[PDB]
Amino acid sequence: SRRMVTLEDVDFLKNLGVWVEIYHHLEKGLLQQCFNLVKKNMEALYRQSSFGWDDSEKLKEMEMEKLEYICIFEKTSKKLVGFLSFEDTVEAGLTCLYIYEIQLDEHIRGRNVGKWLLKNASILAYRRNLKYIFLTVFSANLNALNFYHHFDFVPHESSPQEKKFRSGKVIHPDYYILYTKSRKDW
Ligand SMILES: CC(C)(COP(=O)(O)OP(=O)(O)OC[C@H]1O[C@@H](n2cnc3c(N)ncnc32)[C@H](O)[C@@H]1OP(=O)(O)O)[C@@H](O)C(=O)NCCC(=O)NCCS
Ligand SMILES: [Cl-]
């Protein structure tokens, strides 16, 4: 058929039939649910990268004390449908919120929930006197790459760069390090 930590704008989620919670640490059950979303969304991308995928390794990462979680659940099912995780840190001398994950279940993508999570992360960062937002992204993840570009992320000086030599050597990095300034006004 090809030719026919007070969060902002919570009312937006209410209008979608979802709600948000902030976690300092994930409880055992929810840890497993978030892991399931990351694995479902990302396993293939991790596999094809130099980083690889290890279930046990991703799990331990998500348990790290430094990571804070913003989680969105469906009002009817009370199931997790998305989250954003981050740490407050420093990157090359710059104070930042470093995003580890932004993950949405398939059925809730493309409805401005990604924007909602990113915007709130950015606001939180600014209010914590964190001047930048940083993240890593796979070069092969084209949708995410363009999503970030739209929200003014650009490669940090520390990001790997494309390189081509007359010798025939071609270097395509499998990830970028992106950043942008945090902002309180959206
Ligand atoms: C990446 C992700 C979180 C973005 O969420 P999303 O639901 O798809 O995007 P949203 O609907 O919330 O985006 C809203 C804004 O982003 C823009 N946008 C979204 N995707 C875009 C794309 N591929 N190219 C250009 N702009 C894009 C929209 O224009 C919109 O901006 P606007 O209101 O100013 O017009 C989502 O696609 C996802 O969960 N992907 C799977 C997991 C993943 O790859 N995470 C990144 C690695 S951790
Ligand atoms: Cl990615």
Ligand with minimal distance to 151 CA: 1
Nearest atom within ligand 1 for CA of residue 104: 39
Q: Are 86 and 119 in contact (CB under 8 A)?
A: no
3-state secondary structure 15-53: CCCEEEEEECCCCHHHHHHHHHHHHHHHHHHHHHCCCCC
Q: Do the annotations mark residue 103 as ligand-binding?
A: yes
Q: Do the annotations mark residue 111 as ligand-binding?
A: yes
Q: Do the annotations mark residue 36 as ligand-binding?
A: no
Q: Are 126 and 88 in contact (CB under 8 A)?
A: no
Instruction: State phi, psi for 127 to the nearest 5 degrees.
Output: -70, -20
3-state class (DSSP) for residue 80: strand
Q: Do the annotations mark residue 32 as ligand-binding?
A: no
- Hey, whose CA ends up nearest to atom 33 of ligand 1? 112
Q: How was this structure determined?
A: X-ray
Instruction: State phi, psi for 105 to the nearest 5 degrees.
Output: -65, 155
Using a 10 angstrom Cβ sphere, with 0-12 exposed, 13-18 middle and 19 or more buried, the burial of residue 109 is middle
- Hey, whose CA ends up nearest to atom 19 of ligand 1? 147
115 alpha carbon to ligand 1 midpoint, in Å? Answer: 7
CATH architecture for segment(s) 1-186:
3-Layer(aba) Sandwich (3.40)
CA–CA separation, 176 and 158 (whole Å): 9
Which pair of structure tokens corresponds to residue 4?
């026919």
Nearest atom within ligand 1 for CA of residue 38: 42
What is the experimental resolution, given in Å to one decimal place? 1.9
Within a 13 Å sphere around the CA of 67, how many CA atoms are in the beta-carbon half?
A: 22
CA–CA separation, 46 and 50 (whole Å): 8
Per domain, the residue ranges of the chain are 1-186
Question: The dihedral of CA 176, 181, 120, 7: what is its sign?
Answer: positive
- Hey, whose CA ends up nearest to atom 30 of ligand 1? 112
